[PDB]
């Protein structure tokens, strides 16, 4: 009894964790797992990945790749008589899915920051070609708009830590300086955190930052990142069981949602109007300046 | 035609293995070879033997074993590959099997030589889990080259590759009052954790305790501060091994052990140990951040 | 079926007209209307009359006149459009023709109000070529709003839209020993030139002589320093005019003059005039470059 | 007597100048000109542009859009019995073309910088999907390689000034700091120049920069940009005359090349070795530092 998994061939952290989670469950059920990987490139890429898994004589599919609603339906088409469970959707996808509430993760983030009293807030989305990123960005916009705040700046990365840094620097070097940032995944946050820091500012204290995923490394970012936990362990367990129900011709054939949670660590703080004095401010320097003469 | 290659890998969502598997796919794409992956439920050699049997059932044309195995365990696993070209990305002392691994002998030398050159003497080690042969070799290497530079390490400790295990060991060590000036760490995640431990212990990475990673995984260039570490080029290892495996399935290869080079990547976690006033080149940093921080408040005004 | 629209434009490779024509295409693409362009050999009204006759020969379904014409000249050109809906992107005082232009009344107010608010009193004007009615209106505007703020400009001068004419006038002015604290400039290219003139005259843009553009063309966000200027949204003007023209060819439109808004875009060329009491936020610039420059040499060490 | 021109619908400076140049000539000859524009999107886009111009009952075509060698031949196919002259090519295109020597423009740039003594050099290409940018990048690589230098970093923009800035910042913020930059067009240079400047460095003195096009604005960049002049006035004049020959069934049916030239302004300088003294270096500061106390 064998299950096929298709996944972005792109070595990001969450997709890695998700695939671990899936294996972990299947182990407990004694179902074997095989993985094919999807060469970026959208929907035709995925249609091919599927065809391998099918050739493998699998008993069911788990599509762990982010697809447009139109693209998903196409991919479902390929699964000729094979139960297929997608880990993308949006709201009224007429396919079998499990995804986390994005509606929650965005609310939570925004509500957390707004409660701390931040008004000058900025957004750092994933690559908007990806529907993940699109939804999360919409969510933020919605709940900010719903709290009479329009974000002071938005920007798009690609999920990488380094894209996080580059956008956050570009923004700061334009002289746009928020007191808080909503970031679309934990790797981009890390990069944004460095950008802040190297820009002579303090994470939390000066610019608060809020991640999205609570991937493993995040609890140990410096300082430990406040972020939206999506429980991938859970998503694995869930989807496998769901898929097995599906192959028995008896399931909640349709969309399904999983909860998220805020994880408050040390990157979020009431915005400090950290108003230092004119004459002692120039002092920090009037020593600094001398130190070089020593050199 | 086409041709299909099986990959067995730790089912453990670490960064390097993830990158390695990406690197393998990336190449096979260029050659039009398809790839399938089975995953290995920790648990050593029997686990792997099983992983293999699936890949074989899959009607593959060759195997790439991306899981860390003892010399004895590897040979066993090789046994399972009934008639199927198999290329291991582990090896050790006496391996009579087809392998490609990075020079550990280099990566350890480089690290040690880098730190010793900066003038560190009170050095500490942070190994991977020694049940893993990766970690064992790298630890031996360090020991060797330190010993070879008349230094015996002031403390060694073992993690499990995780960032969090990095933190816990580094805290445990510091809270014992053992305080090195430098740390050799066995992978970039454990480094991250060690870095936090240092930092939260009221100390400065580089300036007070220098740290040196191992892997140069993607995130590392953006650790705060950017981590100095031993680059292993996984992009390369992928490309290499696939090509090697395809040679192998054509009955004409360097049937045996093979080694890939590594390199040091000097970033901002390494610094001459506390010399009492500061270095020229990091000062124009340390200050330009100090000068940058006050630039902000003065802006804010 | 489809439908085809003719565009007449200055054959003179300036930035805004280029952008405008891009904007027009961009929209027509979305509507599936095709576009053809004829170009107007400077030379005023006869030139344009000819341009039109080609577009008509082309069997178009409507015209967009993107060339600057006197009220008298426009009416003449309108005459040529024998039975063909024609929409002008010029207008002036009494235009009884179909037009869309930006509020010049706003763009001049905004500029003047921005500078006056920063506290500049010694202000100078740098108009486009006054043979062009663009330039004339914008110059009048400035005069009006300055006069309305009890300031008469200390010097005015005319360019030709080119960057280089910007430079030559601004040098000529400075070398006469007229030195304003601020300049209103009639388009972003001339500003660039003026900015160089200032700079090479040993003075600092913003800090010493503030400068304010007009258009916010693409390049301007990257002038050194990024130019403060009046944004006219050409993307918009394109979209607007095409839709308006298509309404027109259906015999149902706001047959007459129409106005589009403008906006100020505050970048780093505008600053309270010299006080050796410099501003908090631009100081942590002026200095963090001064501090950045020395950071370099100190690094270089 | 009427000539059709197809051009990128993308409001860059050189294409604008080129189209001016074409008109300017045709005026002198009393030939009229009409322009259709090409909606990015490669070869199908262009095949359509052509069909309009043809519908217009023109007497000849000038294709001012950058095409692959394969794509060009396709587009030539569409010109059913109509003389067509392309302003793209590469070396052995079997079509009628006029382009500038890219082989020269790259040599000149490299030779200019190498002569000044720069070794740590960096490249800033146009969008490599465009064949323009590809050739120019190859050229640089070639002549650098030919001068025993491998570039310290290469990067790709999109012709925009802003993409010039973003790549140059990204590079500098990575801590890669060349002494010289070869840039693939004058707008990207401008952006790179700001990036340098805002990075606390001096154009020329610290990082020399060399453009490509000598478009109008460039003589007034701050500081006036050193760049490879391509004479678009000339290219206009040339191509119109050539096209008219062509419609008379008597021309140099084939590839043709135009020269380029270096224009030395104030962005190029022997790389500085200025070791300033320890004790006076710290002094620049120990005043600077006080100035802020004023506030």
Return d(Cα D33, Cα A45) in angstroms, integer: 45
Sign of the dihedral through C-alpha A84, A86, A89, A92: positive
Residues of C in contact with D52 (CB under 8 A): 34, 36
Tokens of A290: 């001398």
Residue A124 CA to residue A158 CA, distance in Å, equals 10
Class of domain D101-229+260-275: alpha beta
| Contact residues on chain B for A206, CB-CB shorter than 8 A | 296
Residue in D190, D193, D292 closest to C283 by CB: D292
Whether the CA torsion A84, A88, A92, A98 is positive or negative: it is: positive
Interface test with C, best of A172, A175, A274, A277 (most C CBs within 10 A): A175
Contact check, Cβ <8 Å, C288/B292:
yes
Which chain C residues contact residue D37 at CB under 8 A?
21, 25, 35, 37
Q: 3-class secondary structure for A170-211?
A: HHHHCCCCCCEEEECCHHHHHHHHHHHHHCCCCECCCEEEEC
Helix (H) or strand (E) holding D290: helix D278-291
Q: What are all long-range contacts of A45-52, with beta carbons under 8 Å and residues at least 24 apart? A: A46/A6, A46/A71, A46/A75, A47/A74, A47/A75, A47/A78, A49/A6, A50/A4, A50/A6, A50/A75, A50/A78, A50/A79, A51/A78, A52/B34, A52/B36
Chain A nearest-CA distance from B148, in A, is 34
Q: Which residues of D touch A170 (CB under 8 A)?
A: 166, 169
CA distances from A76 to A79, A130, A244, A251, D108 (A): 5, 19, 17, 17, 56
Task: Give the ranges where C32-70 is alpha helix by DSSP (H).
Answer: 44-57
User: Which tokens hold the place of D258?
Assistant: 């135009």
Residue A100 CB neighbours (<10 A): 21
Helix (H, G, I), strand (E, B) or coil at C272: coil
* Alpha carbons D186 and D220: distance in angstroms, whole number: 11
User: What is the number of other CB atoms lying within 10 angstroms of the CB of residue D175?
Assistant: 10
Work out whether the CA dihedral B107, B111, B114, B119 comes out positive or negative: negative
Phi/psi-derived region of residue B236, left when phi > 0, alpha when psi is between -120 and 50, beta in every other case: alpha
Please state how this structure was obtained. X-ray
CA distance C112 to B38: 70
DSSP code at position A216? G
Which uninterrupted H or E stretch holds D167?
A: helix D161-173
Rounded-to-integer distance, Cα B225 and Cα B207, Å: 11
With 0-12 CB in 10 A as exposed, 13-18 as middle and 19+ as buried, what is C175?
Answer: exposed
| Number of Cα atoms under 13 Å in the Cβ half of residue C56 | 16
Fold of B103-231+262-277: Rossmann fold (3.40.50)
Beta bridge mates, B127: B158
Calculated CA dihedral for residues D41, D44, D46, D48, nearest 10 degrees: -120
Residues in chain A within 8 Å Cβ distance of B54: 32, 34
Residue D162 and residue C221: Cβ atoms within 8 Å? yes
Q: In whole angstroms, give the CA distance from residue A130 to residue B26.
A: 20
Cα-flanking dihedrals φ and ψ of residue C61, to 5°?
A: -110, 5
Closest Cβ–Cβ partner in B283, B284, B295 for C288: B295
The three-class DSSP label of residue C163 is helix
Residues B287, C295: C-beta atoms closer than 8 Å: yes
**Inter-chain residue contact D162 with C222, CB threshold 8 Å:** yes
Residues of D with CB under 8 A from a CB of B: 292, 295
User: Rounded CA gap, C294 and D200, in Å?
Assistant: 9
Task: Note whether D152 and D119 are within 8 A (CB).
Answer: no
Q: Which two tokens stand for residue C139?
A: 């110059």
A vs B: CB pairs below 8 A: 149
Q: Which chains lie within 8 Å of chain C at 3 or more CB pairs, if any?
A: A, B, D
Instruction: Measure the CA–CA gap between D45 and D48, rounded to whole angstroms.
Output: 5
In what helix (H) or strand (E) does residue A23 lie, and over which residues does it extend?
A: helix A13-29
Question: How near does any CA of chain A get to the CA of B36, in Å?
Answer: 5
What DSSP character marks residue A83? Answer: -
Q: What is the DSSP string of chain B?
A: ---EEEEEEESS--HHHHHHHHHHHHHHHHHT-EEEEEEE-SSHHHHHHHHHHHHHHTT-S-EEEES---HHHHHHHHHHSTT--EEES---TT--S-B-EE-HHHHHHHHHHHHHHHT--SEEEEE--TTSHHHHHHHHHHHHHHHTTT---SEEEE--S-HHHHHHHHHHHHHTT---SEEEESSHHHHHHHHHHHHHTT--BTTTBEEE-SB--GGGGGSSSPPBEEE--HHHHHHHHHHHHHHHHTT-S--S--EE--EEE--SS---S--SS--HHHHHHHHHHHHHHHHHHHHH-
- C19 and C217 in contact (C-beta within 8 Å)? yes
In D, which residues are within 8 Å of C283 by CB distance? Answer: 291-292, 295
- What token pair was written down for B117? 């050159």
**Beta carbons of C268 and C211 less than 8 angstroms apart:** no
Q: Minimal Cα distance from B24: which residue of A?
A: A9
| Number of residues assigned to chain A | 295
- Cβ-based neighbours of D74, under 8 Å, separated by 6 or more: D43, D47
Contact A274, B297 (CB under 8 A): yes
Residues A109 and A105: their CA atoms lie apart, in Å, by 6
User: What phi and psi, each to the nearest 5 degrees, are found at residue A208?
Assistant: -75, 150
Chain A positions touching C298 (Cβ under 8 A) are 292, 295
| Chain B residues close to A19, C-beta within 8 Å | 13, 39
**What's the residue count for chain C?**
301
Query: What are the helix and strand counts (H, E) for chain C?
Result: 9, 12
CA nearest B142: which of B176, B177, B172, B180?
B180
Contacts of B193 in chain A (CB under 8 A): 220
The HSE-up count of residue C202 (CA atoms within 13 Å, CB side) is 3
Q: Which of C189, C222, C278 sits opposite D161 (nearest CB)?
A: C222
d(Cα B42, Cα B24) in Å, to the nearest integer? 21
Q: How many CB atoms are closer than 10 A to CB C252?
A: 8
Residues of chain B found within 8 Å of residue C287, distances taken between Cβ atoms: 295, 298
Is the backbone peptide bond immediately before B225 cis, with ω within 30 degrees of 0?
Answer: yes
Cβ distance A282 to D288 less than 8 Å, yes or no, reads no
Q: Are D17 and D221 in contact (CB under 8 A)?
A: no
Residue (of A38, A42, A47) closest to A15 by Cα position: A38
Distance CA C90, CA C74 (A): 8
Answer for the pair C93, C141: CB distance below 8 angstroms, yes or no: no
Contact between C283 and B298 using a beta-carbon 8 Å cutoff: yes
In angstroms, the Cα distances linking B287 to B280, B299, D286, D289 are: 10, 17, 13, 12
Q: Give A2 to chain D, closest Cα distance, Å.
A: 43
**CA C228/CA A66 separation, integer angstroms:** 41
Q: How many CB atoms lie within 10 A of CB B149?
A: 16
Q: Report yes or no: A262 and A116 within 8 Å, Cβ to Cβ.
A: no
Q: How far apart are CA B104 and CA C136, in angstroms?
A: 76
CB C103 within 8 A of CB C262: yes
d(CA C265, CA A283): 35
- C-alpha span between D1 and C223 (Å, rounded): 42
Rounded Cα distance, C293 and B66, in Å: 49
Contacts of C189 in chain D (CB under 8 A): 217
Identify how many contiguous H helices and E strands chain A contains and give both numbers. 9, 12
Of the candidates A256, A198, A199, A188, the one whose C-alpha atom is nearest the C-alpha of residue A221 is A188
Give, rounded to a whole angstrom, the gap between the first and last alpha carbons of chain A: 71
Neighbours of chain D (3+ CB pairs under 8 A): A, B, C
The secondary element (H helix, E strand) that includes residue D122 is: strand D121-125
Calculate the alpha carbon distances from A35 to B27, B59, B112, B241 in Å: 17, 15, 39, 19
State the nearest Cα–Cα gap between D142 and chain C, in angstroms: 30
Chain B residues whose CB is inside 8 A of the A295 CB are 277-278, 280, 283
Beta bridge partners of C158: C127
The encoded tokens of residue C3 equal 């439908």
- Residue A169 and residue D169: Cβ atoms within 8 Å? yes
Q: What is the token pair recorded at C238? A: 């394109």
Neighbours of C42 (CB within 10 A): 11
Chain D nearest CA to B225, separation (Å) = 13
Give the largest Cα separation in chain B, rounded: 75
Query: Cβ(A285)–Cβ(D289) under 8 Å?
Result: yes
Q: Are B64 and B234 in contact (CB under 8 A)?
A: no
Of C268, C281, C298, Cβ closest to residue A292: C298
Please state, as a whole number, how many other Cβ atoms lie within 10 Å of the Cβ of residue A45: 18
Question: For the packed helices A13-29 and B15-31, what is the interaxial angle rounded to 10 degrees?
Answer: 100
The first and second tokens of residue B101, run together, are 């691994």
What SS3 state is found at C230? strand
- CA quadruple B191, B197, B200, B203: dihedral sign: negative
Token pair 């008896």 is found at A250
By Cβ distance, the residue of B280, B291, B298 closest to C280 is B298
Q: Which residue of B has its CA nearest to A274?
A: B297
Place of tokens 């589009």: C260
Say how far apart CA D190 and CA D216 lie, in whole Å.
13
Query: Residue A91 CB: number of other CB atoms within 10 A?
Result: 10
CATH number of the domain at B3-102+232-261, please?
3.40.50.2300
* Under 8 Å between Cβ of B51 and B20: no
Residue D82 CA to residue D102 CA, distance in Å, equals 28
Contact C164 D216 (CB under 8 A): yes
Sequence-separated (6 or more) residues with CB below 8 Å from residue A218: A186, A189, A190, A211, A224, A225, A227
User: β-pairing, A121-125 with B34-40?
Assistant: unpaired
Q: How is residue D286 written in tokens?
A: 């120990």
What is the distance, to the nearest Å, from the Cα of residue B160 to the centroid of all Cα atoms in its chain? 12
Q: How far is D226 from chain C (nearest CA, A)?
A: 15
* Core vs surface per residue C76-96: b (16+ CB within 10 A) or e: ebbebbeebbbbbbbbbeebe
Equal CATH topology for A1-100+230-259 and A101-229+260-275: yes
Q: Quick one: which of A264, A203, A216, A163 has its CA closest to B192?
A: A216
Gap between the Cα atoms of D245 and D250, Å rounded: 6
Chains B, C: CB contacts within 8 A come to 39
Contact D292, A289 (CB under 8 A): no
Q: Give the minimum alpha-carbon distance from D9 to chain C in angstroms, rounded to a whole number.
A: 6
Q: Are C201 and C64 in contact (CB under 8 A)?
A: no
Task: Please provide the DSSP assignment of D52-102 as one string.
Answer: HHHHTT-S-EEEES---HHHHHHHHHHSTT--EEES---TT-SS-B-EE-H
| Shortest CA gap A275–chain D (Å) | 13
Residues of C with CB under 8 A from a CB of B: 280-281, 283-285, 287-288, 291-292, 295-296, 298-299, 301
Helix/strand/coil for D16: helix
Cα A58 from Cα C136, distance rounded (Å) = 76
Q: Judging by DSSP bridges, how do beta strands A261-263 and A227-229 pair with one another?
A: antiparallel
Neighbours of chain A (3+ CB pairs under 8 A): B, C, D
Overall resolution, Å: 3.1
CA distance A144 to A123: 11
Cα(D167)–Cα(D162) distance, integer angstroms: 9
Which one-letter DSSP state was computed for residue D27?
A: H
Find the Cα–Cα–Cα–Cα dihedral A14, B63, B44, B102, rounded to 10°.
-80
HSE-CB for C86 with a 13 A CA cutoff: 24
User: Do β-strands D227-229 and B86-88 pair in parallel, antiparallel, or remain unpaired?
Assistant: unpaired
Helices B234-249, B15-31: axis angle to 10 degrees equals 50
Q: In sequence order, what are the residues at sequence separation of 6 or more whose Cβ sits closer than 8 angstroms to the Cβ of residue C247? A: C253
CA separation for the pair B247, B64 (Å, rounded): 13
Q: What is the Cα–Cα distance from C12 to C20, expressed in whole angstroms? A: 13
Of C236, C194, C239, C243, give the one whose Cα is nearest residue C214. C194
In angstroms, rounded to a whole number, what is the distance separating the alpha carbons of residues C187 and A218?
50
Long-range contacts of D241-246 (CB under 8 A, 24+ apart): D241/D25, D241/D29, D242/D85, D242/D96, D242/D98, D243/D3, D243/D60, D243/D61, D243/D62, D243/D83, D243/D85, D244/D29, D244/D31, D244/D60, D246/D60, D246/D83, D246/D85, D246/D96
**Cβ separation of C283 and D276 shorter than 8 Å?**
no
Interface contact D23-C15, CB threshold 8 A:
no
Nearest to D67 by CA among D49, D83, D80: D49
Query: Which residue is associated with the tokens 């189209």?
Result: D19
Residue A145, token pair as written in the block: 């708009």
> Residues with Cβ < 8 Å from D15, sequence gap 6 or more?
D7, D8, D64
| DSSP class per residue in C256-269 | S--EE--EEE--SS
Q: Which residues of chain A make contact with B67, given a CB cutoff of 8 A? A: none
Selection from C227, C203, C193 nearest residue C213 by Cα: C227
Q: Which two tokens stand for residue A74?
A: 């196409």
Record: fold of A1-100+230-259: Rossmann fold (3.40.50)
Instruction: Name the phi and psi angles at B83, rounded to 5.
Output: 70, 10
Domains in chain C: boundaries = 3-102+232-261, 103-231+262-277
Closest-CA distance of chain C to residue B204, Å: 20
Q: Residue C179's CB: how many other CB atoms inside 10 A?
A: 16
Number of residues that this document lists for chain D: 295
Half-sphere exposure of C231 (CA within 13 A, CB side): 10
**Chain-chain contact of B283 with A275 (C-beta, under 8 angstroms):** no
Q: Which residues of B fall within a CB distance of 8 Å from D295? A: 298, 301
State the Cα–Cα distance between residues B31 and C299, nearest whole angstrom: 46
Cα–Cα distance measured from residue B101 to residue B97, given in angstroms and rounded to the nearest whole number: 12
Determine whether the interchain pair C36/D52 forms a contact, defined as Cβ–Cβ distance below 8 Å.
yes
Chain A interface with D: residues with Cβ < 8 Å: 165-166, 169-170, 173, 278-279, 281-283, 285-286, 288-295
């Amino acid at each position: 009894l064998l299950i096929g998994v298709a996944t972005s061939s792109l070595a990001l952290h969450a997709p890695s964790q998700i695939v671990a989670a899936i294996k972990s469950r299947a182990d407990q059920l004694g179902a074997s797992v095989v993985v094919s990987m999807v060469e970026r490139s959208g929907v035709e890429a995925c249609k091919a990945a599927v065809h391998n898994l099918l050739a493998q004589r699998v008993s069911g599919l788990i599509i762990n790749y982010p697809l447009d609603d139109q693209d998903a339906i196409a991919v479902e088409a390929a699964c000729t008589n094979v139960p297929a469970l997608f880990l993308t959707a949006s709201d009224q996808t007429p396919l079998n899915s499990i995804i986390f509430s994005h509606e929650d993760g965005t609310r939570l983030g925004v509500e957390h920051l707004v409660a701390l009293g931040h008004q000058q807030i900025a957004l750092l989305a994933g690559p908007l070609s990806s529907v993940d990123a699109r939804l999360r960005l919409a969510g933020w916009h919605k709940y900010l708009t719903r709290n009479q705040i329009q974000p002071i700046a938005e920007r798009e990365g690609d999920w990488s830590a380094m894209s996080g840094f580059q956008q956050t620097m570009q923004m700061l070097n334009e002289g746009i300086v928020p007191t808080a940032m909503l970031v679309a995944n934990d790797q981009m946050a890390l990069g944004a955190m460095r950008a802040i820091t190297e820009s002579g500012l303090r994470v939390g204290a000066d610019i608060s930052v809020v991640g999205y995923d609570d991937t493993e490394d995040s609890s140990c970012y410096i300082p430990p990142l406040t972020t939206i936990k999506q429980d991938f362990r859970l998503l694995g367990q869930t989807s496998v069981d769901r898929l097995l129900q599906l192959s028995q011709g008896q399931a909640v054939k349709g969309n399904q949602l999983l909860p998220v949670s805020l994880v408050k660590r040390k990157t979020t703080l009431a915005p400090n109007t950290q108003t230092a004095s004119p004459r002692a401010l120039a002092d920090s320097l009037m020593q600094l300046a001398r130190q070089v003469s020593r050199l």
